[PDB]
Structure 1
Amino acid sequence: IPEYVDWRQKGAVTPVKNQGSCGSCWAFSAVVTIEGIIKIRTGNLNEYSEQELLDCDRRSYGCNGGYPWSALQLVAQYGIHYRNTYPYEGVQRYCRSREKGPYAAKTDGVRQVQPYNEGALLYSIANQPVSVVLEAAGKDFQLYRGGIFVGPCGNKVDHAVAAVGYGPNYILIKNSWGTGWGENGYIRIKRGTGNSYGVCGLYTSSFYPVKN
């Protein structure tokens, strides 16, 4: 795998989104990985529905939080609609996936990266954008403006985001806090520190969709 990866340069990343006050990050992270793998497999970059996962993932909890793995399982089992078809509303509502016609895209499964293993995550990101979790509660992270973030942060992961690239000393993260946070909505988090958890627990729980 290469020394630099940046799925934005390969046209596999849609514009940065803002989840608002709703605890819907698990869905934004999952959707990022679906947008990426659909671009990788088909050549088309589309936006897919975070709102659909909020409403329809019966194993997540809407705006009270959820599981990127559960949302990716849902996209593999049923599918997902285009964002413009099922736009983000910032509130959980009833599942409307049936009333909106056929699903726009569908995947074939979901994998987990070996946890607490930096190289396994780098391999996965070299293949595609990956759903990852981290500790975002620390004000150092909340207030991040740019540069390669080294912390301070603990391993108390509470926030799902998406890894869309990496470099020698960092992993490139698409956050769901709008384009005004960090580096136009992105954060570069230092890697290679030898702490198995990753900076801010970045290696705790990483999933990606499978699409043949």
Structure 2
Amino acid sequence: IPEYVDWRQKGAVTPVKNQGSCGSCWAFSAVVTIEGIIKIRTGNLNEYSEQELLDCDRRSYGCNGGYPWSALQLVAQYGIHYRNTYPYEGVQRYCRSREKGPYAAKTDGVRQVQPYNEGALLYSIANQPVSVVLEAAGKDFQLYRGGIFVGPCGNKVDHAVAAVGYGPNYILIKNSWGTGWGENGYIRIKRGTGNSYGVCGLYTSSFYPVKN
């Protein structure tokens, strides 16, 4: 895999989103990875529905949190609608997939990266955007404006985001806090520190969709 990856440069990343007050980061993270894998496999960059996963992932808890792996499973076993067909409302509602016509895209499964393994995570990013988790509760993370973030932060992961690239000393993260947070909505988190958890627990739980 190469020294630099940045899926934005390869037209595989949609604009930065804002999850709002809703604890729907798990759905935003999954959707980032679906938009990426659909671009990689088909050549078209589309936006898909975080709200659909929020409403319909019966293993997640709506705005009280959820599981990126479960949302990616949901997209692999049914499919997902375009974001515009099923726009984000920032509140959990009744599942409306059946009422929104045929699904726009469908994947074939979801694989997990080996946890606590930086190279394994980098390997997946070189193939596609990956759903990752991290500790976002620290004010240092909350107030991040730019640069390669090294913390302070613990390994208490609580926030799902998406890794869309990396470099020799960082992993590139698409967050769901709007375009005004971080580096136009992104954070570069230091890698290569030798901490197996990853900086901010970044290596705790990583999933990506599979689409043949």
State whether TM-score is above 0.5: yes
> Aligned partners of 2:115 and 2:55: how far apart in 1?
28
* TM-score, normalised via structure 1 length: 1.00
How many angstroms apart in 1 are the aligned matches of 2:157 and 2:185?
A: 19
Which residue pairs with 2:186 in the alignment? 186
- Map Cα deviations across residues 84-109 of structure 1 (whole Å, 9 max, x no partner): 00000000000000000000000000
RMSD of aligned alpha carbons? 0.2
What is the DSSP-based 3-state SS (H/G/I as helix, E as strand, rest coil) of the residue aligned with 1:85?
coil
Shift of 1:185: 0.2
Equivalent position of 2:99 in the other structure:
99
How far does residue 31 in structure 1 lie from its aligned partner after superposition?
0.1
Task: State the Cα deviation string for residues 2-35 of structure 1 (Å, max 9, x = none).
Answer: 0000000000000000000000000000000000
**How far apart are residue 36 of structure 1 and its match?**
0.1
Cα displacement string for residues 131-150 of structure 1 (whole angstroms, at most 9, x for unaligned residues): 00000000000000000000
Moved over 6 A (4+): none
Residues 147-182 of structure 1 deviation map (CA, whole Å, 9 limit, x = unaligned): 000000000000000000000000000000000000
> How much has 1:74 moved relative to structure 2?
0.0
Structure 1 counterpart SS, 2:99 = coil
State the Cα distance separating 1:80 from its structure 2 match.
Answer: 0.1
CA distance in 2, matches of 1:91, 1:193: 38
- Between the aligned partners of 1:30 and 1:195, the Cα distance in structure 2 is 25
Distance in structure 2 (CA, Å) of the matches to 1:145 and 1:128: 25
Calculate percent identity across the aligned residue pairs.
100
Instruction: Specify every segment of 5 or more residues in structure 2 that has no aligned partner in the other structure, as ranges.
Output: none
Q: Gapped runs of 5+ residues in structure 1?
A: none
Aligned length: 212
How far apart, in 2, do the equivalents of 1:9 and 1:203 lie? 24
Q: Which residue of 2 aligns with 1:70?
A: 70
Secondary structure at the counterpart of residue 8 of structure 1:
helix
**TM-superposition CA deviations, 1:24-59 (whole Å, max 9, x none):** 000000000000000000000000000000000000
State the TM-score, normalized to the length of structure 2.
1.00
Equivalents in 2 of 1:195, 1:73: separation in Å?
30
